[PDB]
Amino acid sequence: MDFLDRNAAPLNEGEWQRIDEAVVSTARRTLVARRIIDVLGPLGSGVYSIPYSVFSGKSPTGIDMVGENEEFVVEASRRATINLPILYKDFKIMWRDVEADRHLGLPIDVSTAAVAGNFVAVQEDHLIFNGNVELGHDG
Amino acid sequence: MDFLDRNAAPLNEGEWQRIDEAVVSTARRTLVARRIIDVLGPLGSGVYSIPYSVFSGKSPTGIDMVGENEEFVVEASRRATINLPILYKDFKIMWRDVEADRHLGLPIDVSTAAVAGNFVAVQEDHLIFNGNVELGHDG
Protein backbone atom coordinates (compact mmCIF):
# COMPACT_ATOMS: atom_id res chain seq x y z
CA MET A 1 0.00 0.00 0.00
CA ASP A 2 1.28 3.35 -1.18
CA PHE A 3 -0.75 6.15 0.46
CA LEU A 4 1.72 6.28 3.37
CA ASP A 5 5.17 7.44 2.25
CA ARG A 6 7.32 5.14 4.41
CA ASN A 7 10.33 5.88 2.17
CA ALA A 8 9.79 9.57 1.39
CA ALA A 9 10.22 10.88 4.94
CA PRO A 10 13.87 11.49 5.92
CA LEU A 11 13.54 9.23 8.96
CA ASN A 12 15.42 5.93 9.04
CA GLU A 13 13.38 2.82 9.79
CA GLY A 14 14.73 2.64 13.34
CA GLU A 15 13.08 6.01 13.88
CA TRP A 16 9.90 4.73 12.22
CA GLN A 17 10.01 1.78 14.63
CA ARG A 18 10.32 4.23 17.53
CA ILE A 19 7.51 6.48 16.23
CA ASP A 20 5.02 3.66 15.68
CA GLU A 21 5.89 2.33 19.14
CA ALA A 22 5.36 5.84 20.58
CA VAL A 23 1.92 5.85 18.97
CA VAL A 24 0.82 2.31 19.88
CA SER A 25 1.95 2.61 23.51
CA THR A 26 -0.31 5.66 23.88
CA ALA A 27 -3.23 4.20 21.93
CA ARG A 28 -3.29 1.21 24.28
CA ARG A 29 -3.08 3.55 27.28
CA THR A 30 -5.77 5.94 26.05
CA LEU A 31 -8.49 3.80 24.45
CA VAL A 32 -11.36 2.53 26.56
CA ALA A 33 -13.67 1.36 23.76
CA ARG A 34 -11.49 -1.53 22.57
CA ARG A 35 -11.68 -2.90 26.12
CA ILE A 36 -15.50 -2.87 26.05
CA ILE A 37 -16.40 -3.41 22.40
CA ASP A 38 -14.86 -6.00 20.10
CA VAL A 39 -12.94 -4.84 17.04
CA LEU A 40 -14.26 -6.03 13.68
CA GLY A 41 -11.49 -6.36 11.11
CA PRO A 42 -9.36 -4.40 10.50
CA LEU A 43 -10.60 -4.27 6.92
CA GLY A 44 -8.07 -2.14 5.05
CA SER A 45 -8.37 1.41 3.79
CA GLY A 46 -10.78 0.71 0.94
CA VAL A 47 -13.84 -0.23 2.98
CA TYR A 48 -15.64 3.11 2.77
CA SER A 49 -18.93 1.93 4.30
CA ILE A 50 -20.43 -1.16 5.92
CA PRO A 51 -24.03 -2.44 5.93
CA TYR A 52 -25.38 -3.68 9.25
CA SER A 53 -28.57 -5.19 10.69
CA VAL A 54 -30.57 -3.62 13.54
CA PHE A 55 -32.70 -6.24 15.33
CA SER A 56 -34.42 -3.64 17.50
CA GLY A 57 -37.73 -5.52 17.63
CA LYS A 58 -39.02 -8.68 19.30
CA SER A 59 -41.18 -11.25 17.53
CA PRO A 60 -42.67 -14.59 18.56
CA THR A 61 -40.96 -17.98 18.53
CA GLY A 62 -42.77 -20.98 17.07
CA ILE A 63 -43.72 -24.05 19.09
CA ASP A 64 -45.33 -26.96 17.26
CA MET A 65 -45.36 -30.74 17.18
CA VAL A 66 -45.43 -30.61 13.37
CA GLY A 67 -43.13 -27.67 12.66
CA GLU A 68 -44.93 -26.19 9.66
CA ASN A 69 -45.83 -22.51 10.10
CA GLU A 70 -43.40 -20.07 8.48
CA GLU A 71 -44.61 -16.80 10.06
CA PHE A 72 -41.94 -17.28 12.75
CA VAL A 73 -39.06 -15.75 10.78
CA VAL A 74 -36.90 -13.12 12.45
CA GLU A 75 -37.10 -9.74 10.73
CA ALA A 76 -34.42 -7.10 10.73
CA SER A 77 -36.28 -4.15 12.24
CA ARG A 78 -34.20 -1.97 9.98
CA ARG A 79 -31.21 -2.47 7.71
CA ALA A 80 -28.66 0.32 7.53
CA THR A 81 -25.20 1.34 6.34
CA ILE A 82 -22.66 3.53 8.15
CA ASN A 83 -19.63 5.32 6.68
CA LEU A 84 -16.17 5.15 8.27
CA PRO A 85 -14.70 8.65 8.66
CA ILE A 86 -10.99 9.30 8.86
CA LEU A 87 -9.82 10.25 12.33
CA TYR A 88 -6.54 12.14 12.12
CA LYS A 89 -4.13 14.56 13.79
CA ASP A 90 -0.89 16.10 12.52
CA PHE A 91 2.41 16.20 14.42
CA LYS A 92 5.37 18.22 13.18
CA ILE A 93 8.95 16.99 13.65
CA MET A 94 10.97 20.19 13.19
CA TRP A 95 13.91 19.94 10.84
CA ARG A 96 16.89 20.87 13.04
CA ASP A 97 15.95 18.16 15.54
CA VAL A 98 16.80 15.72 12.76
CA GLU A 99 20.28 17.24 12.41
CA ALA A 100 20.57 17.21 16.22
CA ASP A 101 20.04 13.46 15.91
CA ARG A 102 22.41 13.18 12.93
CA HIS A 103 25.37 14.78 14.72
CA LEU A 104 24.58 15.60 18.36
CA GLY A 105 23.28 12.06 18.93
CA LEU A 106 20.32 13.29 21.01
CA PRO A 107 17.37 11.31 19.57
CA ILE A 108 14.24 12.84 18.09
CA ASP A 109 11.45 14.22 20.32
CA VAL A 110 8.78 11.71 19.28
CA SER A 111 6.64 12.99 22.16
CA THR A 112 4.91 15.12 19.53
CA ALA A 113 3.90 11.83 17.89
CA ALA A 114 2.75 10.45 21.25
CA VAL A 115 0.56 13.53 21.84
CA ALA A 116 -0.93 13.15 18.35
CA GLY A 117 -1.63 9.48 18.99
CA ASN A 118 -3.39 10.46 22.22
CA PHE A 119 -5.49 13.08 20.43
CA VAL A 120 -6.51 10.51 17.82
CA ALA A 121 -7.43 7.92 20.46
CA VAL A 122 -9.43 10.54 22.39
CA GLN A 123 -11.31 11.37 19.19
CA GLU A 124 -12.00 7.68 18.57
CA ASP A 125 -13.51 7.38 22.05
CA HIS A 126 -15.39 10.67 21.70
CA LEU A 127 -16.93 9.44 18.44
CA ILE A 128 -17.86 6.05 19.90
CA PHE A 129 -19.48 7.39 23.08
CA ASN A 130 -21.04 10.43 21.35
CA GLY A 131 -21.68 10.11 17.63
CA ASN A 132 -20.72 13.18 15.62
CA VAL A 133 -23.71 15.33 14.66
CA GLU A 134 -22.30 16.44 11.30
CA LEU A 135 -21.62 12.85 10.20
CA GLY A 136 -24.98 11.79 11.66
CA HIS A 137 -23.38 8.92 13.55
CA ASP A 138 -24.87 7.77 16.83
CA GLY A 139 -23.04 6.69 19.97
CA MET B 1 61.19 21.63 25.11
CA ASP B 2 60.55 19.68 28.31
CA PHE B 3 59.00 22.14 30.78
CA LEU B 4 56.05 22.80 28.46
CA ASP B 5 53.67 19.97 29.27
CA ARG B 6 51.75 19.18 26.09
CA ASN B 7 51.14 15.43 26.52
CA ALA B 8 49.51 14.99 29.94
CA ALA B 9 46.92 17.54 28.84
CA PRO B 10 43.87 15.99 27.12
CA LEU B 11 43.70 18.45 24.23
CA ASN B 12 44.53 17.30 20.71
CA GLU B 13 46.99 19.02 18.39
CA GLY B 14 43.96 20.30 16.47
CA GLU B 15 43.05 22.19 19.65
CA TRP B 16 46.62 23.29 20.43
CA GLN B 17 47.07 24.83 16.97
CA ARG B 18 43.89 26.87 17.43
CA ILE B 19 44.87 27.98 20.93
CA ASP B 20 48.40 29.02 19.99
CA GLU B 21 47.17 30.77 16.84
CA ALA B 22 44.63 32.68 18.96
CA VAL B 23 47.43 33.73 21.32
CA VAL B 24 49.81 34.74 18.53
CA SER B 25 47.14 36.71 16.64
CA THR B 26 46.00 38.43 19.84
CA ALA B 27 49.59 39.43 20.62
CA ARG B 28 50.23 40.69 17.08
CA ARG B 29 47.09 42.80 17.31
CA THR B 30 47.74 44.06 20.82
CA LEU B 31 51.45 44.88 20.94
CA VAL B 32 53.02 48.25 20.28
CA ALA B 33 56.59 47.46 21.33
CA ARG B 34 57.38 44.88 18.64
CA ARG B 35 56.66 47.68 16.14
CA ILE B 36 59.04 50.30 17.54
CA ILE B 37 61.50 47.68 18.84
CA ASP B 38 62.88 44.58 17.15
CA VAL B 39 62.74 41.05 18.53
CA LEU B 40 66.08 39.60 19.61
CA GLY B 41 66.20 35.82 19.56
CA PRO B 42 64.01 34.12 20.70
CA LEU B 43 66.55 32.31 22.89
CA GLY B 44 64.63 29.42 24.44
CA SER B 45 63.40 28.89 27.98
CA GLY B 46 66.73 28.39 29.64
CA VAL B 47 68.36 31.84 29.48
CA TYR B 48 67.78 33.43 32.89
CA SER B 49 69.86 36.55 32.14
CA ILE B 50 71.66 38.15 29.21
CA PRO B 51 75.00 40.00 29.12
CA TYR B 52 74.69 43.14 27.01
CA SER B 53 77.11 45.90 26.02
CA VAL B 54 76.36 49.57 26.62
CA PHE B 55 77.98 51.87 24.06
CA SER B 56 76.68 55.31 25.12
CA GLY B 57 79.62 57.18 23.59
CA LYS B 58 80.39 59.43 20.64
CA SER B 59 83.57 58.78 18.66
CA PRO B 60 84.84 59.43 15.12
CA THR B 61 85.08 57.23 12.02
CA GLY B 62 88.16 56.32 10.01
CA ILE B 63 88.73 58.01 6.66
CA ASP B 64 92.03 57.30 4.90
CA MET B 65 93.51 55.62 1.85
CA VAL B 66 94.88 52.76 3.99
CA GLY B 67 93.54 53.51 7.46
CA GLU B 68 96.64 53.26 9.64
CA ASN B 69 95.07 54.56 12.85
CA GLU B 70 93.25 52.33 15.36
CA GLU B 71 91.78 55.14 17.48
CA PHE B 72 88.42 54.39 15.88
CA VAL B 73 87.33 51.32 17.86
CA VAL B 74 83.80 51.29 19.26
CA GLU B 75 84.13 51.22 23.06
CA ALA B 76 81.76 49.41 25.42
CA SER B 77 81.35 52.10 28.08
CA ARG B 78 80.00 49.38 30.38
CA ARG B 79 79.25 45.71 29.72
CA ALA B 80 76.18 45.39 31.95
CA THR B 81 73.64 42.55 32.32
CA ILE B 82 69.91 42.08 32.89
CA ASN B 83 67.72 39.26 34.21
CA LEU B 84 64.71 38.07 32.17
CA PRO B 85 61.47 38.06 34.21
CA ILE B 86 58.56 35.79 33.42
CA LEU B 87 55.30 37.49 32.49
CA TYR B 88 52.37 35.10 32.82
CA LYS B 89 48.63 34.79 33.24
CA ASP B 90 46.49 31.71 33.80
CA PHE B 91 43.12 30.55 32.47
CA LYS B 92 40.80 27.55 32.84
CA ILE B 93 39.20 25.30 30.22
CA MET B 94 36.30 23.40 31.78
CA TRP B 95 36.23 19.60 31.60
CA ARG B 96 32.70 19.88 30.19
CA ASP B 97 33.99 21.92 27.25
CA VAL B 98 36.75 19.39 26.53
CA GLU B 99 34.36 16.42 26.57
CA ALA B 100 31.93 18.38 24.41
CA ASP B 101 34.56 19.06 21.78
CA ARG B 102 35.72 15.41 22.09
CA HIS B 103 32.25 14.06 21.23
CA LEU B 104 29.92 16.79 19.86
CA GLY B 105 32.57 18.85 18.05
CA LEU B 106 31.58 22.09 19.79
CA PRO B 107 34.86 24.05 19.66
CA ILE B 108 36.81 25.07 22.76
CA ASP B 109 36.11 28.54 24.17
CA VAL B 110 39.62 29.68 23.19
CA SER B 111 38.52 33.26 23.92
CA THR B 112 40.00 32.47 27.34
CA ALA B 113 43.41 31.93 25.72
CA ALA B 114 42.94 35.13 23.69
CA VAL B 115 42.14 37.10 26.86
CA ALA B 116 45.26 35.70 28.55
CA GLY B 117 47.37 36.58 25.51
CA ASN B 118 46.00 40.13 25.56
CA PHE B 119 46.71 40.53 29.28
CA VAL B 120 50.30 39.28 29.02
CA ALA B 121 50.83 41.50 25.97
CA VAL B 122 49.58 44.48 27.98
CA GLN B 123 52.00 43.54 30.76
CA GLU B 124 54.85 43.25 28.24
CA ASP B 125 54.11 46.77 27.00
CA HIS B 126 53.80 48.05 30.57
CA LEU B 127 57.18 46.54 31.47
CA ILE B 128 58.83 48.00 28.38
CA PHE B 129 57.45 51.55 28.52
CA ASN B 130 57.06 52.04 32.28
CA GLY B 131 59.79 49.74 33.56
CA ASN B 132 59.31 48.07 36.91
CA VAL B 133 60.47 48.99 40.40
CA GLU B 134 60.72 45.60 42.11
CA LEU B 135 62.56 43.87 39.26
CA GLY B 136 64.78 46.95 38.97
CA HIS B 137 64.16 47.11 35.22
CA ASP B 138 64.52 50.65 33.96
CA GLY B 139 62.16 51.42 31.09
Nearest chain B alpha carbon to A104: B104
Q: Chain A contact for B73, CB < 8 A?
A: no
> Would you tell me how many other CB atoms lie within 10 Å of the CB of residue B44?
7
Residue A40: left if φ>0, alpha if ψ -120 to 50, beta else—which one? beta
Q: Chain A contact for B99, CB < 8 A?
A: no
> Would you tell me how many other CB atoms lie within 10 Å of the CB of residue A116?
20
> Would you tell me how many other CB atoms lie within 10 Å of the CB of residue B110?
20
A40/B111 Cα distance (integer angstroms): 67
Residues 6+ apart with CB under 8 A from B54: B76, B77, B78, B79, B80
CA distance to partner chain A, nearest, from residue B111 (Å): 23
Resolution in A: 3.6
B5/B1 Cα distance (integer angstroms): 9
Residue pairs between chains A and B whose CB atoms are closer than 8 Å: 5
Q: Minimal CA–CA distance to A28: which of A108, A132, A92, A114?
A: A114
Alpha helices, DSSP H, located in B1-139: 13-30, 33-36, 95-101, 111-130
Burial class (CB in 10 A: 0-12, 13-18, 19+), A137: middle
Tell me if residue B36 falls in helix, strand or coil: helix
Query: Around A130, how many Cα atoms within 13 Å sit in the side-chain half-sphere?
Result: 5
Q: Minimal CA–CA distance to B81: which of B54, B52, B55, B56?
A: B52
Name residue B74's amino acid.
Answer: V
Obtained via which technique?
Answer: cryo-EM
Q: Chain A contact for B105, CB < 8 A?
A: yes
Helix, strand and coil content of chain B, in percent to the nearest 5, comes to 35, 5, 60
A11/B109 Cα distance (integer angstroms): 33
> Looking at beta carbons, which residues of chain A come within 8 Å of B105?
103
Count of positions (residues) in chain B? 139
DSSP string, B40-58: -----TT--EEE--B----
Is the bond into A42 cis (omega within 30 degrees of 0)? yes
Helix axes B111-130, B13-30, angle to 10 degrees: 40
> Looking at beta carbons, which residues of chain B come within 8 Å of A103?
104-105
DSSP string, chain A: --SS-TTTSS--HHHHHHHHHHHHHHHHHH-SHHHHS-------TT--EEEEEE-----PPP--SS----------SEEEEEE-PPP-------HHHHHHHHTT-----THHHHHHHHHHHHHHHHHHHS--TTTT---
> Looking at beta carbons, which residues of chain B come within 8 Å of A105?
103-104
